[PDB]
Each structure stands twice: as C-alpha cells, then as structure tokens.
Amino acid sequence: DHEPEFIGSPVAADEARSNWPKRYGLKARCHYRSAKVDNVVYCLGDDVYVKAGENEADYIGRITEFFEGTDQCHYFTCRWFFRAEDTVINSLVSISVDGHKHDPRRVFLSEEKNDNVLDCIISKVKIVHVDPNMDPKAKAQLIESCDLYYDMSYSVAYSTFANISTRTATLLDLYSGCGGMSTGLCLGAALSGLKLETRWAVDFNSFACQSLKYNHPQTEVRNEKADEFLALLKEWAVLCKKYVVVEKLVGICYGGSDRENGIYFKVQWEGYGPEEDTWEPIDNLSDCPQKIREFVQEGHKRKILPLPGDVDVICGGPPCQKDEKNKQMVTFMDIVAYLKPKYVLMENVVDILKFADGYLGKYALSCLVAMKYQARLGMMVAGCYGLPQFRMRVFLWGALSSMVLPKYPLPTYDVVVRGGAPNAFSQCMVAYDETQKPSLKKALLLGDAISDLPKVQNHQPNDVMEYGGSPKTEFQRYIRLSRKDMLDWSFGEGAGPDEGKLLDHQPLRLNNDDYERVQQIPVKKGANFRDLKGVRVGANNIVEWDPEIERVKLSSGKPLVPDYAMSFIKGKSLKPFGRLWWDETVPTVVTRAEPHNQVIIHPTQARVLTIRENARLQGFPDYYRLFGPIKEKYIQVGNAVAVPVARALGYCLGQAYLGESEGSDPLYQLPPSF
Amino acid sequence: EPEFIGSPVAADEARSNWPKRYLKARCHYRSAKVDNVVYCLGDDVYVKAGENEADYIGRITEFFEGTDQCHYFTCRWFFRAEDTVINSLVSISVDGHKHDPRRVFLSEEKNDNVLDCIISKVKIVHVDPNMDPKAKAQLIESCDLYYDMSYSVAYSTFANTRTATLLDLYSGCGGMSTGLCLGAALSGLKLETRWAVDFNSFACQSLKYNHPQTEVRNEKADEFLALLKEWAVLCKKYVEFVVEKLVGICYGGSDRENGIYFKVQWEGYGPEEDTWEPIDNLSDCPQKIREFVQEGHKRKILPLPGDVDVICGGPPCQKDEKNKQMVTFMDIVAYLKPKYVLMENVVDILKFADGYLGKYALSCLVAMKYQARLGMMVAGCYGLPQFRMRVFLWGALSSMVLPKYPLPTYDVVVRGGAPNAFSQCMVAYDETQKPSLKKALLLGDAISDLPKVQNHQPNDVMEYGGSPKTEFQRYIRLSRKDMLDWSFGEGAGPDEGKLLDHQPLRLNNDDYERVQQIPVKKGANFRDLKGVRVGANNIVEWDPEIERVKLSSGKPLVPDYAMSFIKGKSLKPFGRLWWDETVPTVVTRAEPHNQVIIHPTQARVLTIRENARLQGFPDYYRLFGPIKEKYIQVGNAVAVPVARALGYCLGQAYLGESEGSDPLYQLPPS
Amino acid sequence: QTARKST
Ligand SMILES: Nc1ncnc2c1ncn2[C@@H]1O[C@H](CSCC[C@H](N)C(=O)O)[C@@H](O)[C@H]1O
Ligand SMILES: Nc1ncnc2c1ncn2[C@@H]1O[C@H](CSCC[C@H](N)C(=O)O)[C@@H](O)[C@H]1O
C-alpha cells in the first residue's frame, strides 16, 4: 500500500492558467483537483497538516493548487494557517490577561503559501470558520465540532490580526500628561466627522492634570495612579449596583498617598471652604445615605466615572521606564481588560520592540488579541506629518471584532525615513516604499516653526505676552488658530479663553554662570563651547585646553568651561552649549531643556529654546496652556506625543468608528492636510 | 497548728516599735509557726489571697495577737509587674526586652492577715546596678525572686559647666525642646538640642530659625530610626558624572524606596541639579562618602547610642492603628538608650482602652529596666491664663536619679478630672495651703500689652504699640539671654525687641461681617445677632418676627449651622471671651463659629502671638509658614512654663542634686 | 570620585 502521487482527471483543460498563471510563464505541466497520498485523496479547499523541518512547526494549510511541473515531482501548494505562536508574538501565548488566555486550538489565516511534495502531508484537518455575530452554542457548537477554528487573518505586514472576509464617542486617556495624544485624536475625529470627547484623563502628575483640565474644561481629570484608579473603578461599579460637622461630598477616590488602600470621600463641612477639605474613609462615614446615595446616583448620571458599558476609545502612554515595573503595560491592559473599549490606541517608544525583542510589544499585542480584539501595530515618525523633528514611536491599534480597525496614515512629510527597523517589526512601519508620493511639503525646519515670535530673554516671568507680529509661514499661520477653526470644541461653541494671546513663551532661567556662558557663545551656525577661551584639537577633535591662555573667572569666579564639557564623549562631543539654526531639525524634543549637553538654544537669542518654542516643535496649538514651574511644563511638553501625528490617527480611527473605509489595506492617505 | 512560737512577747518595746497598735494589737511576737515551718520577722513569703487568684508576695513586719485573740501577721507587699498600674500589658516586648516572671517591686504598702494564710517561704533577693556582670546573674540563679526597684502607686513610680545633649521627636516649633532647655539652664545644667525630628516642613522651619545649631530633620520618626541603624553600621567603616560634596543623607523619603540616599553635588553643576541618589550609584565615588561620613561623625550630625542624654516625647496618639507612633518612639529609645526620657501626651492615654497606652509606655520603659514615674500637669498652675492638663512620663537609667514633677506655681483650682486607671498621677497641692502661690492669670494679664491690629494684618514683624503693662507681659518680652536660650551663645539673638507674628486668621468677608456685627459686650455670642429665642431646653430658634438678614454679599448672618450645635445651647459659637477670664485650652484651629476665639474688643478673633503668649511662648520666639499653619504650630506646643519647670527638675536629677524620693519637687524664683 | 544619577 504505497501510492504516492496525484489522482487524475480533466486537469481542467485549461482554466489552469486562467486561475493561476504564475506558472505557465515553479512550473506546471498540468494540475489536478485531487491527489492521493496513502489511503486518502485530498481535494482543494481542504485543511491539512503539512510536515515541517524535523522537530519544528507542523504547518497548517488550505490546498490551493495541485500540479506537476518540470522535473516531475508532484506538488501541492497550500496557503498557510497561523498559530499565535507562529506570529510575531510567540512565547507570549503563555500570557493570561484576566480570564483571557490563548485558545490552543485557534488560528489566523494568512495569505502565504509555499510549494511542497505531496510526500509531506501528515493528515487533513477540519478547520472551521467562525464569525463575530453568533449566539451561545451557535459558537459553542461550531467550536466543539471541529479540530480548530479561525475568526481572523494574521497578516505579518503590520502584525495585523483583522476580521476575516453629529455623533459621540467617549475617550479614556490614561497616562495623559497634558493630553497631546488625546487632543490630537479629538481633532482628527472632527474631520472624520465623529465627535470624540475626552471624558476621563488619568495622570499622576498634578501639573499635567491642570494643563489638561484647563484646556479641556469638561472632562474628568483624575490625578492618581492607574492601579488606584482601577481599584476605584471596580468599587464604584459595586456602588452603582447598590444605590442604583461634615456637610457635603465633593469627591471620591482610592487613597493615593498610600492611605490604607480603601475608598475615601472628599469632605466639606459647615462654614469651612474648599481649602480645608479632607479625605475620609467610607466606613468613617456614618449610616447617612443621603450624602452617599445621592452622590453615587448624581455622579452616575453625570458619568463622572466609567462603567464597562460605556467607553468608545482609550489611549495610553504607559512609560514602562522579565517585568521590571513595565507594569503600566500590564496595568494598562488590565484597565482595558476591565472596560472593553471599542477601540484601543497605545503610544510607546520604539525600544519596546528592541529591549529584549519587543517582549513588551508582543505582550501588548498578545493581550490585545487574546481578548479577541482586532489588533495592528505600526511605527510613525513625527516629521512626516510636518514637524521640524524626527520623532519615531510605536502605535498599537486595538479595535474590536464588532468594529472596523483604524489604518495608519501615510506620512504627510518628505522627511527621509531610514528605518531603525528592529527585526520582528521590520515590516511594521509607515512610509512610502518606493512611490512618488510627491508630498513636496518640504521638510519643516526650525526657522519655519519658531520664526514668528517676540524676542525674549533668559528671564521672562510672564505666561501671557503678545506676539506683536503676524504669522510668517504656513506652519506658523497654521499653529495659531482659534479652537473653533481647529475644532478643539471643548468649549461650548463660544470662544475659548486666551484668544489670540501668546502663552508660556519663556525659557528656564540659567544660574548666572550658565547664563554668561551662553552669552559668550557665538551666533554662528555651528556654535559650541568649543569656541571659548581655551580651544583644543587632536585626533579625537577632543577638547584639551588652549594654553598660553588660562582659564577664566565669571563674576562668581567659576570657570568659563566646566570640565564635563571637556570630558563628554571622550571629549569628541560637539553637543554642549550649542546653537541651532533656522535650517536645523531637532531629532526629538526632549522633556528637559538645559544647555549642558544638548544644543537646545535659540538661533539668535542668547537663551534656551522657550517652552512654547518646544510645544511648537511638538505641534501644540499656540492656544494650548501649560501650568506649573517652567521645568514641570517643559517636561509636560517633552513627554507628549506629537499632536499632528495623534491627529492623523484621530482621523483614520474617526472613520473606522463610523465604518467608512476600504479593507485589507494597511495604510491610508489623508484628503487635505488630515 | 497556727500558734505563736518565738518565745514571749515583744515586752512592750513593741509599742515604741509599733505605736499605732495601741486594728489594735494586744500583744507582739518575733516569730510564728504555721503548719510545721517557722518564720521570723523580715522573712520573705507567699500569702494566700482571695479565691482563685494570685498569691500576694510579702515581707513580714509584724506578729501580733488582735484584741480578738485572733492571730495576725502584718506584711509589706511585693508587687508583680502585673499587680502594678501596668496590669496586663506585661506581654509587651520591645527590641528583645521583656518582663522577667520572677522580678518584683517593693511596696511600702501593708496588710494584716490571719496566719493560716501563709503558703510557704519565698527567697527574695535584691540587686543593684553596681553589681554588673554575673554578679547579679549568680544571685538570680540563687534566688526564687529578685528586686532592683520599688513601686509606689503614686505616679506609678518605679524607683530604685556640664553639658547634656537632647533629642526631640515630633517637635514642632520646639516648644518643649526649648522650655526644657531653659529649665535645664536654670538647674545649672546646659541642655542643648542636638537633633530634632519633625514631619511638618514649617515647624522645622521655625525650630531651625530659633535653634540654628540643632540638627533639624524633616522626616518621619521611623525613617530617622532606620537611618540611625544604618548610620551606625556605615559609620563604622566610614565607607555617569563626577561627584562632589555629598551634602545629605536620608533613609526612605517621598517616593524613595527604603535605603540610604545622598544629596549630591556634581562638579560645576550648581545647587539645582543636586539630586538624592541611592547608596549604590555612589559606589564609583566611595571617597566622597567616606569623607562625608567622616566629618559627620566628628560633628555628631546623627546620634549614636552613648551620645543621646535626654530625649523628648510627644508622639501623637490619634491600638495597633494610629497608636503606632508611640511604638516607634519607644523603639528609638531602645536603640539609643539615653539616660533620661520625657514623654508628653494628652490625657486620654490613661482614659482610652482603659489606659492601654499609658501602661504601654510605662512597661516599655520598665522592661527596658528604666526607672519610670508619671504625672498629669495643668498648664495654668504654672503661669498661663488657661487650663490645659497633659500627661508626662518620666524615665531614667538606674545609673541616674529619677526626676520629679514641679508643683503648681499658681492658685488655679484643680478639679481632679484624673482618670481612675491612674488616680494619683496628678501633681497638685492636696489642700496644704501653701498659698504662697500666685494669682491665676486671666487673658488681660497676658495680652493687654499688644498693640491694636485689624482682621487683615499681613506683617510677620511689626513694632510694639506699647510697653509691658503687667508682670507677665514684662516676662514674655525678654531677650533670649535674659532667659537662658543660649541658642546664639554669647551675643544677641536676631529679631531684637521686635514684635513678630501678630496676625489673626483672615476671615472671608462675611465672617468679617458677622464678627463686626457682634456686640463687644462681655458675654457676646451669636445669640445677639437678631435670630434669638428660647426653649424649655434653650434652643436658638428664629424669632418668628424679623425677616432673615442678608449681608452686603449674597449671604445671611449664617446661623445656618450655628443654630444647631449642641442641638442649640452652645453659647460657645460665635462669641467673644475676655480679659476677665481664661481659655481652657488653646487649640490648633482659629475659627469663630464653634470656638469663642474672638478678641474681646477688636472684632478680629485671636492673633497667633496672643495664642503663643497663652502658650507661654517667649516673644523672641519666631514661627514660619502661612497663618493657618503657624496656628497649628502653637496649638500643638507644650506650655513653655511647664516644660521649663520639668527642665529644672530634670537638671537637678541629671546633676544629682535631689532629696530622698517622692513624686514632686519645689523651687524658689524659677 | 564619581557616581551616577537615577530616574
Ligand atoms: N503610574 C502612573 N499612573 C498615572 N500616570 C502615570 C503613571 N506613571 C507615569 N504616569 C504619567 O505618564 C506621563 C507620561 S506619558 C504622557 C504623554 C501624553 N500622551 C501626551 O503626549 O501628553 C507622565 O506625565 C506621568 O505623569
Ligand atoms: N508621624 C510623624 N513623624 C514625624 N513627626 C510627626 C509625625 N506625626 C506627627 N508629627 C509631629 O507632631 C507635631 C505636633 S505635636 C508636637 C508638639 C511639640 N512637642 C511642641 O511642643 O512643639 C507636628 O509638628 C508633627 O511634625
């Protein structure tokens, strides 16, 4: 009993070339709609196990072709099925988020094939196709009745797991900082025509909240930890269940100064105002319902806090500075696991994919899918999208089975991407392969960004100044726009505060030493500390003292050149105390501006690039206010994800929500400036 | 059987030996045989006590035949670490310290019981510190029981130019640290505060201002402790940027994981850029730290066990819960082992959980083999126009002399609101009319001097609108050196003769309005505001006539909550007090509605300075932070005069001047 | 001689 070759029959005259003429140019003498290996014959559209290399993955396939070709050697080519392990995400199938684990019998249908000898066919398998819409036992039965099922196609392009075959949306911004991502999104949504409101923003930083709250008056800004916020969330659910000297109950929490890990209420009492309020533990409160009952009912109505039922989008920046902290990845996916948004978006640094092999990246992806969530992943550069910087980060799209998943927008600048393209994710990135996209949209430069702005000096203790000038360039013209023209919309269709004004234009003050130092820095293009009394040269370009020239004293007597400048990079560093020019791009706007190591400093002004200059560099609308010590808000800006990028995202998604778009194309192109 | 052996009677030298007898004794022997064993006076023994409860342990002082012909023995009692006021609570361990099931305390207490009551004989030895190693141990091996000390139910007393260093814990503004130091100075001892640990950044601000030399620490007590232990160990060995001048050391912190961090200086980086860095990251620059630790030791920036001499209490007790702070305190005491320990706290300690904490302290002190005593003391008796009763817990080594409580210097009448659990802990005169006591002050004496200022006075410093108008006022405006502050040593302390911190709470306008509205009569309170009436029980109700008055704002005369306080009554709420009298306790919160805080004539409520005067604060003493916090700072403070008195007694104890023990002491000028 | 900063 040893038959090892093709059955035979019409060999289809030829619809063979008609169907699949990549052969007939591999090669095909002719084809067959059936073949016999061992006792059994396999037709097409049949799901089967194929033999891999020894010890390795036993493939899974639908047979597309049977044929014979030059050199004889009977061949079958089947397009592949994917185990979650065979994806970019392997080893992590081990992950469990909540009750969610990866069904060991589950797969994802690629379109990927290969040609093999009929010799390697182990058996044929019954692979059943599911579909999101289905009832209890409608699915149970299909699954029970099967070897395996597939609800989705896994495409390696973007690590895309996808389905196979005015308005409102609420938004939850976690790790929101000042909410650059959140705002930008809400702005793209407007174009798509969707109204995306940010009804909750959670950040630990006090200042980040105020800037965010001030710029988004109607919103719930929670200053606390994701952990805490989650604990609350649950407990609150419990309460909505129930009720659905101290005077009034203004607020609710899970105590962050680590209290004892229990709920607390904000209390106001009898002839003392806001400034005295305290947190008291729920138990410490008497039987008095009217306070509590009416608080929970009132709040619930106001949806001051989310329930799983309603969240339409949630985004996160979790820093995650196996798991060493990095928890916020885990806690992020925990909150997500709880609330079930219809969409997820996650910004993080490229390094996830690098650190140890995208452990975190594959973790986020793995969790997302394990919850049976359309997921795709891509890397975007801030510069495309028109910013005078090269800022590359990673975005995770978590769209729901019941929904359409957002694509990624194609670059809106001609900035040249040279992909740091870490392996597994080499294929995940947004650009034009080779295409005359011809978005001339000349790469933006610093000059274009900050050029219109009143001179300011090392010390400028005024939030609000006047421009005393009109926008110079298309960007600047674009960067100053009423919340209405831009759609920020968070205002009741009446004008926003701080109209046409200028805000947070002010650098940090340098202690007189540093100040003087920058004073002596030339105004030339390549300005560096290297140009100070005490020059240097060597193979290294290394800075070694002048002599014949000796030191210096500032007023304080401190030296002109701190030694560390000399020390940096083996001394070959050209960074300390450096000027930019109008034709220069900052690779990345950074959370902290100090002249010491970075070339942060105005082309002409003797000072450090002012906060607003950075917000501009970061794409913030000029009407966006920042709060707290100059440094704190410097940080706020540095951390933030570029607003234009998040805006484009807000657009693609914006549509995905209303379900208007084509499918199976990983990336988009936006209509005007979107 | 129980016959009186021991030969004839005492012969009537007895009535000279025992006058009281002639329960009256009609005869006296020197010995007794109960059962078949015989004992004589001075023997140690076990007495059968009541039914199913412990056996009194006793020393025989008498053998006599009552007029009854019944035969009795009188014995002086030994107390078990339980039978004392610390009953139960013998269970506490502190840093491997515990009570020792055979250890006792000699009571001068005596009771007479029929003889059949005698179980058998104990052997109770006695041991003094001077024995030292083994010398005790050998004995303790020999004895069935042993005692180093004496228990007196009064104050629960467990009782057997020079320079002293002080450590104050939970010291805001340093009220007690200061007062103590002053008293000590008078004693002839120089007590300087070498460290102070407090959480509040401000109270720290103030303390540092007025005691420039002390080492102030803004941290929790716990941290300071752990930091202490490491500081010891690390102190032993003395050991991507170039560091310089580590300026600081801290264990724990805001976010900081538990461990040591150093404030760091980087070359050419300026004060900004100075960061707290974990011990590990500094490995690369060991020498910097070796250096830092080096001077730090010589400078005694942090205490080591032999170094602490006297140390101040005050842990807030808000059992396991908010009581933790006393546990921490006693732990400090354990690690450091100073010669003297003084703990202040509210009265409830002895009232709450039936005095659980008072005994926690007492025990923790004794199981540590400290001599301990305690007393409750009213602020007023010492020269303040207020009645504030607080608990003070003394402890000292056996190497030292147990301090004592200075009696009232003023005529203030004490109503003995003392808890039972400790009934005789009150330092008060008892009726002995030593009326050589001053006149209990009223508010006028304290503050009549102060210049007139309005609701909004935003000036920490302002000069005096007058001259000291009374003995007191004469007193509190006095140079640091006219008292002995020596904060600045030989020289004049800053803010000379200036009046500081004379400010009230700034009242939201309307308040300014209700207050402005008040009568400035003697008994004025909200009942004079136009809503007034009466009830069988007096309940403010609106007069059913006048329409509700509205202010120049959108607000009422705001009775809204006032009307109901003690469900009415409460003449206490908005209303003035005046020179005619005293504030029972100055509190942390200045605000009119419940407090009767209002200046008698000025319509401004009471400025902090005033409250400080009330608190016995010397005027040269400054404070810091916003108003509301200054207020708290003074509200928490121990009355400085009281601390001053304690400081004196302590000074004497430390120096060894003293007299055969008893709870309380005296002094001339002081 | 030297040390290093932390986040
Ligand atoms: N554990 C935590 N809980 C809540 N917020 C946290 C947090 N850990 C870090 N964060 C916040 O994460 C923020 C950085 S991510 C914010 C970037 C934001 N998308 C924007 O572009 O505006 C920090 O400001 C920090 O406050
Ligand atoms: N957990 C803690 N750690 C350190 N200090 C604490 C503390 N809890 C309370 N405190 C201190 O308790 C002080 C109030 S009571 C201390 C008053 C002090 N004996 C005096 O006479 O001034 C506050 O200043 C606060 O700093």
Picking from B441, B324, B423, the residue whose alpha carbon sits closest to that of residue B376 is B423
User: How buried is residue B467: exposed, middle or buried, by Cβ count under 10 Å (0-12/13-18/19+)?
Assistant: exposed
Q: Please tell me which chains touch A, using 3 or more CB pairs under 8 Å as the contact test.
A: B
CA–centroid distance, B202 to ligand 2, in Å, is 11
Distance from CA of C7 to the nearest CA of B (A): 10
Q: How far apart are CA A339 and CA A98, in angstroms?
A: 12
Picking from A617, A597, A613, the residue whose alpha carbon sits closest to that of residue A605 is A613
Nearest CB to B285; choose among C3, C5, C6: C3
Q: How far apart are CA B150 and CA A305, in angstroms?
A: 65
Picking from B113, B120, B119, B116, the residue whose alpha carbon sits closest to that of residue B2 is B116
Q: How far apart are CA B602 and CA B452, in angstroms?
A: 7
Three-class secondary structure of residue A154 per DSSP: strand
Picking from A378, A446, A448, the residue whose alpha carbon sits closest to that of residue A417 is A378
Report DSSP state, residue A173. E
Max Cα-Cα span within chain B = 99
The encoded tokens of residue B120 equal 């058998």
Whether the CB of B179 sits within 6 Å of ligand 2: no
Q: Write out the DSSP string of A202-227.
A: EES-HHHHHHHHHHSSSSEEEES-HH
Contacts of residue B558 in chain A, CB cutoff 8 Å? 271
**Residues whose CB is less than 8 angstroms from the CB of residue A294 and which lie 6 or more positions away in sequence, other chains included:** none
Nearest CA in chain A to B266: A564
Pick one of 1.10.1200.10, 1.10.760.10, 3.40.50.1110, 3.40.50.150 as the CATH number of A151-444+620-674. 3.40.50.150
Q: How far apart are CA B42 and CA B31, in angstroms?
A: 10
**Residues whose CB is less than 8 angstroms from the CB of residue A492 and which lie 6 or more positions away in sequence, other chains included:** none
Please check whether residue B469 is in contact with residue B447, taking contact to mean a CB–CB distance below 8 angstroms.
no
**Beta-bridge partner residues of A347:** A395
Three-class secondary structure of residue B273 per DSSP: coil
Q: Alpha carbon A50 to chain centroid distance?
A: 38
CA–centroid distance, B211 to ligand 2, in Å, is 17
SS (H, E, C) B434-467: CCCCECCCCHHHHHCCCCCCCCCCCCCEECCCCC
The encoded tokens of residue B485 equal 């502050």
Please check whether residue A483 is in contact with residue A496, taking contact to mean a CB–CB distance below 8 angstroms.
yes
Task: Suggest the residue from B276, B285, B289, B292 to mutate for an interface test with chain C (most C CBs closer than 10 A).
Answer: B285
Q: How far apart are CA A209 and CA A628, in angstroms?
A: 10
Picking from B107, B109, B112, the residue whose alpha carbon sits closest to that of residue B23 is B112
Count CB-CB contacts under 10 A for residue A308: 12
Whether the CB of A335 sits within 6 Å of ligand 1: no
- CA torsion, points B165, B170, B171, B175, in degrees to nearest 10? -110
Q: Quote the strand ranges of A10-58, DSSP E.
A: 30-31, 34-37, 40-43, 47-50
Is CATH 3.30.360.10 the right assignment for the domain spanning B442-616? no
B310-312 and B163-169 strand pairing:
parallel
Q: Write out the DSSP string of A621-652.
A: -TT----SSHHHHHHHHHHSPPHHHHHHHHHH
Q: How many residues does chain B have?
A: 670
Contacts of residue A514 in chain B, CB cutoff 8 Å? 270
Regarding the domain delimited by B148-441+617-670, which CATH topology (the fold level of the hierarchy) does it fall under? Rossmann fold (3.40.50)
Domain ranges of chain A: 1-150, 151-444+620-674, 445-619
Picking from A487, A483, A479, the residue whose alpha carbon sits closest to that of residue A621 is A479
Picking from A316, A329, A398, A321, the residue whose alpha carbon sits closest to that of residue A363 is A329
Count CB-CB contacts under 10 A for residue A119: 12
Q: How many residues does chain C have?
A: 7
Amino acid at A442: K
End-to-end CA distance of chain C: 21
Picking from A375, A296, A283, A502, the residue whose alpha carbon sits closest to that of residue A89 is A375
Q: How far apart are CA B366 and CA B360, in angstroms?
A: 10
How many helices (H) and strands (E) would you count in chain C? 0, 0
- C4 contacts B240? CB cut-off 8 A: yes
Count CB-CB contacts under 10 A for residue A177: 25
Please check whether residue A299 is in contact with residue A305, taking contact to mean a CB–CB distance below 8 angstroms.
yes
This entry's atomic model was obtained through X-ray
Active site residues of B: 317
Helix H or strand E encompassing A163: strand A160-163
For a mutational test of ligand 2's pocket, the pick from B166, B168, B169, B171, i.e. the residue with the most ligand atoms closer than 8 A to its C-beta, is B171
Picking from A483, A372, A406, the residue whose alpha carbon sits closest to that of residue A98 is A372
Kindly report the backbone phi and psi dihedral angles of residue B325, in degrees, each rounded to the nearest multiple of 5, phi listed first.
-65, -30
- B272 contacts A514? CB cut-off 8 A: no
Helix H or strand E encompassing A239: helix A226-242
Please check whether residue A316 is in contact with residue A346, taking contact to mean a CB–CB distance below 8 angstroms.
yes
Picking from A267, A245, A241, A265, the residue whose alpha carbon sits closest to that of residue A255 is A265
CATH dotted code for B1-147: 2.30.30.490
Pick one of 3.40.47.10, 3.90.120.10, 3.30.1490.190, 3.10.129.10 as the CATH number of A445-619. 3.90.120.10
Whether the CB of A388 sits within 6 Å of ligand 1: no
**Residues whose CB is less than 8 angstroms from the CB of residue B321 and which lie 6 or more positions away in sequence, other chains included:** none
Q: Alpha carbon A209 to chain centroid distance?
A: 20
Q: How far apart are CA A416 and CA A442, in angstroms?
A: 11
Q: How far apart are CA A407 and CA A430, in angstroms?
A: 10
Please check whether residue A606 is in contact with residue A458, taking contact to mean a CB–CB distance below 8 angstroms.
yes
Q: How far apart are CA A608 and CA A577, in angstroms?
A: 10
**Beta-bridge partner residues of B149:** B105
The encoded tokens of residue B618 equal 């010397």
**Residues whose CB is less than 8 angstroms from the CB of residue B620 and which lie 6 or more positions away in sequence, other chains included:** B477, B478, B479, B480, B485, B493, B495
CA–centroid distance, A225 to ligand 1, in Å, is 9
For a mutational test of ligand 1's pocket, the pick from A171, A178, A187, A204, i.e. the residue with the most ligand atoms closer than 8 A to its C-beta, is A204
∠B173-B176-B177 over CA atoms, to 5°? Answer: 75
**Residues whose CB is less than 8 angstroms from the CB of residue B51 and which lie 6 or more positions away in sequence, other chains included:** none
CATH dotted code for A1-150: 2.30.30.490
User: How buried is residue B232: exposed, middle or buried, by Cβ count under 10 Å (0-12/13-18/19+)?
Assistant: middle
Q: How far apart are CA A102 and CA A84, in angstroms?
A: 8
Q: How far apart are CA B617 and CA B628, in angstroms?
A: 18
Count CB-CB contacts under 10 A for residue B577: 22
Alpha-carbon distances, residue A196 vs A54, A657, B233 (angstroms) = 53, 10, 59
Among protein residues, the one with the nearest Cα to ligand 2's atom 3 is B220
Q: How far apart are CA A345 and CA A396, in angstroms?
A: 5
Kindly report the backbone phi and psi dihedral angles of residue A147, in degrees, each rounded to the nearest multiple of 5, phi listed first.
-80, -45
Whether the CB of A608 sits within 6 Å of ligand 1: no
∠A235-A240-A245 over CA atoms, to 5°? Answer: 80
End-to-end CA distance of chain A: 66
Count CB-CB contacts under 10 A for residue B414: 18
Q: How far apart are CA B31 and CA B230, in angstroms?
A: 61
Helices (H), B300-378: 324-336, 348-351, 356-367
Q: What is the resolution of this structure in A?
A: 3.2
Please check whether residue B598 is in contact with residue B592, taking contact to mean a CB–CB distance below 8 angstroms.
yes
Q: Is the CA virtual torsion B187, B191, B197, B199 positive or negative?
A: positive
Please check whether residue A219 is in contact with residue A198, taking contact to mean a CB–CB distance below 8 angstroms.
yes
Q: Please tell me which chains touch C, using 3 or more CB pairs under 8 Å as the contact test.
A: B
User: How buried is residue A598: exposed, middle or buried, by Cβ count under 10 Å (0-12/13-18/19+)?
Assistant: middle
Whether the CB of A585 sits within 6 Å of ligand 1: no
∠B368-B369-B374 over CA atoms, to 5°? Answer: 90
Picking from B418, B396, B413, B453, the residue whose alpha carbon sits closest to that of residue B158 is B396
